[PDB]
Ligand binder design. Sequence first.
Ligand SMILES: *O[C@H]1[C@@H](O)[C@H](n2cnc3c(N)ncnc32)O[C@@H]1COP(=O)(O)OP(=O)(O)OC[C@@H](O)[C@@H](O)[C@@H](O)Cn1c2nc(=O)[nH]c(=O)c-2nc2cc(C)c(C)cc21
Ligand SMILES: Nc1nc2c(ncn2[C@@H]2O[C@H](COP(=O)(O)OP(=O)(O)O)[C@@H](O)[C@H]2O)c(=O)[nH]1
Ligand SMILES: [Mn+2]
Ligand SMILES: [Mn+2]
Length: 544
Amino acid sequence: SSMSYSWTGALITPCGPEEEKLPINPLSNSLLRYHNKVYCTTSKSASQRAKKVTFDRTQVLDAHYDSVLKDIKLAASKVSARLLTLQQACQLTPPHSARSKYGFGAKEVRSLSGRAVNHIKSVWKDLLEDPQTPIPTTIMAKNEVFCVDPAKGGKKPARLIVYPDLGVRVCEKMALYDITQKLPQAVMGASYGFQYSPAQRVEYLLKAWAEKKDPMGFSYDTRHFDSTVTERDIRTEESIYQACSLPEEARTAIHSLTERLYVGGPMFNSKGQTCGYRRCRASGVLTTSMGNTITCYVKALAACKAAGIVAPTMLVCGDDLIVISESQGTEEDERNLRAFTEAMTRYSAPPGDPPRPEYDLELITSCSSNVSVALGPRGRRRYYLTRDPTTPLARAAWETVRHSPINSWLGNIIQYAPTIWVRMVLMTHFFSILMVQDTLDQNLGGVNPLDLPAIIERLHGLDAFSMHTYSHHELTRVASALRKLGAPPLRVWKSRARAVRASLISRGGKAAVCGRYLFNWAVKTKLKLTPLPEARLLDLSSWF
RNA sequence: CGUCU
Ligand SMILES: *O[C@H]1[C@@H](O)[C@H](n2cnc3c(N)ncnc32)O[C@@H]1COP(=O)(O)OP(=O)(O)OC[C@@H](O)[C@@H](O)[C@@H](O)Cn1c2nc(=O)[nH]c(=O)c-2nc2cc(C)c(C)cc21
Ligand SMILES: Nc1nc2c(ncn2[C@@H]2O[C@H](COP(=O)(O)OP(=O)(O)O)[C@@H](O)[C@H]2O)c(=O)[nH]1
Ligand SMILES: [Mn+2]
Ligand SMILES: [Mn+2]
């Protein structure tokens, strides 16, 4: 049947010179040694990611799909949505957003400049009326930093990103932005993944897993999920959008966006030639993150009934997904997950790595993270969220003229602040750099470094300063990830942080706070860390 | 490029 893409042969060009590493990486050449292993996915490789994602999709839905889709449309019934004033939509355009062909950019859209407000008024007028003629879209390579894995091919090709003009993107928010805010939370309930915070996700899977008389979990993600999206899939997506209370102007524009934009259309490279025709999800539209999640919930929930997964609890975050269900004996469980994958490929959502049932919560990985255990200050099992530190580390060493990595360090130091690798490797190197730079209180990312103990206690609680025995898996992984990248062994970071703690305490003030809290683990003789006044005297909602 | 915390 349908082919996800049909190419013209025109290279996917780069929309701006690509960064090259320098002969000295001054910030990270103490963090790790093997810089030759850290790469970035240029548009050269885009040529070859194209091959990976072009193929012949063919679905075979069945009574299990159609039973789910029906009650999901019944969830959609209880949702009331509203249009978005052309102004309000312009106000939600991101500040660095890519400018429009027709001479105006994000700065002009957000300040309601006259020229932009008229062009968008006419785009939205072409959206109403003309419901058939496609909307031209642009196709970009996406540059990303990784570590080479010789096992799995050496260097990943660049993911492909496809987006309409800026005029169109404001119109999408008009038609669909309010939908996105309500629909998934309504159709999927507690199974909606983006809803939870890192601590909340953990509390969930822990509850889901103890609620079983004999738990069994697995994760499933589909391969090339943007490409496995058939046209019927998108139109059945609209079928759910339209099931809510919409002003009639919404339905017209929605229906026209689904035809002219979402179901496919031409594609042009940054140079401007014709590049191909797309017949799948264009990753890079408003619905992308929500369509993905909803479609995935349907196909998943369908396949759960086909295979007979019993009492399953779910957690969908886009096309990543995890099911904690009731074990049916080992050898039925293996048979069911094959039925599961079987349905999921008859739904045009084949897997990547084939799923496998696991009976220990640490071995399930969804959204590039897993759950592990450590011991808390009192001796209690503390469950946190961790990951394979390979890619965060490779990114800590990405250092060109344009890009500086200190953001990458903080972004992970916060997100994964309880993990052994952050506590010992990232935090040690972070303060070790800023004390020497003497830039120990800039405003990196709208954040101040000297607040980290307060921020961390706000988000992960005081135990992130006092967690000590680490799970065997997590040790072997951290140890081996450092080894893979040239970084010192954990032993060396223990000594390095012992000293970074010294300079921090001795600097006094808010610095000495960081030294005693973030590096309690380093000292021979701990200090009993009490809560901080800023466990509420810190606004809990600047990003969370 | 889009969504999100
Ligand atoms: O490696 C990432 C990541 O750790 C952090 N980052 C980016 N986006 C987010 C979100 N949504 N939540 C949490 N943390 C985030 O910063 C790194 C990305 O920046 P990068 O260095 O890759 O790009 P540039 O060098 O072009 O720009 C420097 C940025 O650091 C800067 O723009 C800053 O504003 C990043 N930043 C956000 N940026 C953004 O556009 N939107 C957001 O909502 C952002 N939120 C945050 C939140 C925090 C806590 C930080 C530290 C930075 C953020
Ligand atoms: N626009 C955009 N979409 C993304 C990005 N990453 C993931 N997605 C979407 O979410 C889906 C999840 O895919 P992923 O698990 O990252 O890898 P894949 O399934 O092999 O393509 C993708 O097909 C995209 O549609 C991104 O950086 N930008
Ligand atoms: Mn995937
Ligand atoms: Mn995924």
